Amino acid sequence: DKICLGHHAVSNGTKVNTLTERGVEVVNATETVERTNTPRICSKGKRTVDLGQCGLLGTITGPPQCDQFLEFSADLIIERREGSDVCYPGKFVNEEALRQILRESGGIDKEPMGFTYNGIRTNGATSACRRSGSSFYAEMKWLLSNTDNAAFPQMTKSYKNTRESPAIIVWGIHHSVSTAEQTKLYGSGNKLVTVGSSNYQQSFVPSPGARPQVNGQSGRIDFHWLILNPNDTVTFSFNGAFIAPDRASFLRGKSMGIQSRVQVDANCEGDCYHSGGTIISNLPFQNIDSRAVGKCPRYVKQRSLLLATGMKNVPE
């Protein structure tokens, strides 16, 4: 008569790695690295704005793509490859800083600066910016000389920011296809746009010249911007070739901005996003996308790392 002690085992162990050996059979194991993507922007419970064809920076200038996004409000902003910041061709100076501000802004709220204008025209359109026919950036104003070749009376305009939040001010500079048509639009002569607001001083001159056509247009508008802090003034000193800000934009709160190519889906909750979807997982690590943003498991190189949840499996 005797009594034996023992431990359980199985016919099918899972192999794991240790400090001293590779591929040891243990009874049961569980995976530590997430490999399963879910190919949608799992947006349940969140105020979501999908910009589609509007580019993020269009929200402040107002090209036709962005007419319903001029005063959006969101917890989650989604950028699309098809989006475009622009109707008349051009680009933003210091552009990715502005995007990073806007992505986390929780949306923007516009306020007029109410600039009035004596002695020029205020209303230049273009076929690139089509609404009812030939139009222009909604939040800005193509400031022209009265009549063809007429003088551009050297002007100044100021805007103080009344509000308790900082403001995004943006203006434009027009680069005409030629020195000839720089003259037809804003008269002759060296044309200097200068800009300063207390803790910021800078200045601009157009550069007319030939560039290849984009949206049927060989000219360019480059946009500039500055953050005007509460109770500070900005003065716009200029003599033409100046696209002028109609409205200043203010930030609403906090948000999360992402770039994606998959569909929004309000049936699932997630907080870790990448461009091919959402990483839904309790696991500490992931091997799906190193540029995943939000609240994410850590990206690691390994596709798998099994963590033992049972004893060594020793069969006969």
């Binding site: 008569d1 005797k2 950028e79 690590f285 850590r298 963590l307 060594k312 020793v314």
Partner: protein, 171 residues
């Protein structure tokens, strides 16, 4: 490994046992049988459970884009971002594989520990009314029935009762 029990002096384990991790197999008058020790099994499982709650866990620290998949950022800052991200990836890939290996060493050796604690808790019940067979059973040198067996398995067994019987059964 390390505590000598599993894959040690108790060569191979029991595909038979399905109610727990550790157990008793006896051979007496009535015959062979098996039964699982819930108390050591629970001490193992809940230690393993502790590990899982520590690692199947959530960062609440948010990271944002500093990069751009559609309109690439300027290449100098682009290369510093990629250089930094790659360095951080190296750290976490190292941390992850070291974490999993470290806890696997501890898990395996923690299960091995919980049975040597089981072995030597009964070697202590049966005083010297038995000896060690060597391969992890106890030679009971006296008679023990299905009620005397569950006497050991639930930690009631008195050894003074059968001390008499056993001392000269062993000579």
């Amino acid at each position: 490994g390390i505590f000598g029990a599993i894959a040690g002096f108790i060569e191979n384990g029991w595909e038979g046992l399905i109610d727990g991790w550790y157990g008793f197999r006896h051979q007496n008058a009535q015959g062979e049988g098996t039964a699982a020790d819930y108390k050591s099994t629970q001490s193992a499982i809940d230690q393993i459970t502790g590990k899982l709650n520590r690692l199947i866990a959530k960062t609440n620290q948010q990271f944002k884009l500093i990069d751009n998949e559609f309109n690439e950022v300027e290449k100098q800052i682009g290369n510093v971002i990629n250089w930094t991200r790659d360095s951080i990836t190296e750290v976490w890939s190292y941390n992850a594989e070291l974490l999993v290996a470290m806890e696997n060493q501890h898990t395996i050796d923690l299960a091995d520990s919980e049975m040597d604690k089981l072995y030597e808790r009964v070697k202590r019940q049966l005083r010297e009314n038995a000896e060690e067979d060597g391969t992890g059973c106890f030679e009971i040198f006296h008679k023990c029935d299905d009620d005397c067996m569950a006497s050991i398995r639930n930690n009631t067994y008195d050894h003074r009762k059968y001390r008499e019987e056993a001392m000269q059964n062993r000579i």
